[PDB]
Structure formats: structure tokens, C-alpha cells
């Protein structure tokens, strides 16, 4: 469940604003739905190779295909920064 | 990686569903940062709607308003009911 991680992010963006049980259920359904869309898409992309392998390249493509264009562009940049910070 | 979202469960979930036989170490980091980005976008807009309506908490109505007024979120997420 992403609810605790959604809560932590809510408190960085709106320190002084809370969230109802029903609203948090909606946020958590959004995140699960996107996860599955990106996972399914990355699964097709990786299906080309034997030993199907999902790397940051498959995720990056999956993001550029599934997300609307301006969301995709910001998400790709976020994805890239996080792998650069992890790597270095 | 800077993130609040969890990198750990992703590789296990992908293997256990046979989404792939192998997962690179960058893939879960990338994916968690993307999910965190989208949560932050929705929350920021939902919270703005709460504040604009003089509320101190986000309720379903605030998320519905946030998604409905945003062309890309409406496309990605679909309709929000109640």
C-alpha cells in the first residue's frame, strides 16, 4: 500500500493540509493503476529479449508511451535524476 | 535517490507476476520516482482546491476537481466519481 508514502508527500507539498480516509483511498487507487499500466507496458517492451529484463530503459519508454506528453517529460526527468543520485 | 516512495517491493512484485525474469537495479528507483512525481502533482492540485474552498483537509471532491481541471491528469487518470 502507498498510503503512508502518499501521506509523507502530501506533508512536503501542503504541510498544513490533511486528507480524508476516502480521498486517500482514491490517491492509492491512482498510484496502483499507474504502477500496473507502467509494469504491463515495460513487460511488453522486455518481451522482445530472451531472459526478459526490465531496466530503467524499459521503464523510461513505458513512461513516454503511457503518460500524457508534459507529465511524461517531467516524470522522465524525475526518473533520470533519481537513478543519477542512486548511481553516483 | 532523494525519494519518499519505496524502491524495495518493486523487483519482487515484477518477478512474482512474471512481468520479467530479471529486473535491473535502476528500474525500481526510476519507477518509484515517477509514481512519487504523479502523487505529488495530484496532491498539490487537490490541496490547492481544499485551500481555495477554505478547507484544512482534502476530500474526494477536491481530487475530482483537481483531476477534472487538468487536461493531462483527466487523460491519465480518467473520471473521478464522488
Amino acid at each position: 500500500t502507498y498510503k503512508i508514502y502518499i501521506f509523507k508527500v502530501l506533508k512536503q507539498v501542503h504541510p498544513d493540509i490533511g486528507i480524508s480516509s476516502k480521498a486517500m483511498g482514491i490517491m492509492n487507487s491512482f498510484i496502483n493503476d499507474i504502477f500496473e499500466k507502467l509494469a504491463q507496458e515495460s513487460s511488453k517492451l522486455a518481451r522482445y529479449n530472451k531472459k526478459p529484463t526490465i531496466t530503467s530503459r524499459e521503464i523510461q519508454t513505458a513512461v513516454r508511451l503511457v503518460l500524457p506528453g508534459e507529465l511524461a517529460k517531467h516524470a522522465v526527468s524525475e526518473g533520470t535524476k533519481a537513478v543519477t543520485k542512486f548511481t553516483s | 535517490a532523494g525519494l519518499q516512495f519505496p524502491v524495495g517491493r518493486i523487483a519482487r512484485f515484477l518477478k512474482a507476476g512474471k512481468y520479467a525474469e530479471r529486473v535491473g537495479a535502476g528500474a525500481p528507483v526510476y519507477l518509484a520516482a515517477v509514481l512519487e512525481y504523479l502523487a505529488a502533482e495530484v496532491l498539490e492540485l487537490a490541496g490547492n482546491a481544499a485551500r481555495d474552498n477554505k478547507k484544512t483537509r482534502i476530500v474526494p471532491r477536491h481530487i475530482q476537481l483537481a483531476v477534472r481541471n487538468d487536461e493531462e491528469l483527466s487523460k491519465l487518470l480518467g473520471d473521478v466519481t464522488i
Binding site: 501521506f7 490533511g18 480524508s20 480516509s21 | -
Partner: peptide, 5 residues
């Protein structure tokens, strides 16, 4: 009714 998360 919709209690705080």
C-alpha cells in the same frame, strides 16, 4: 462519514 486517514 469520512474520518481522517
Amino acid at each position: 462519514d469520512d474520518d481522517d486517514y
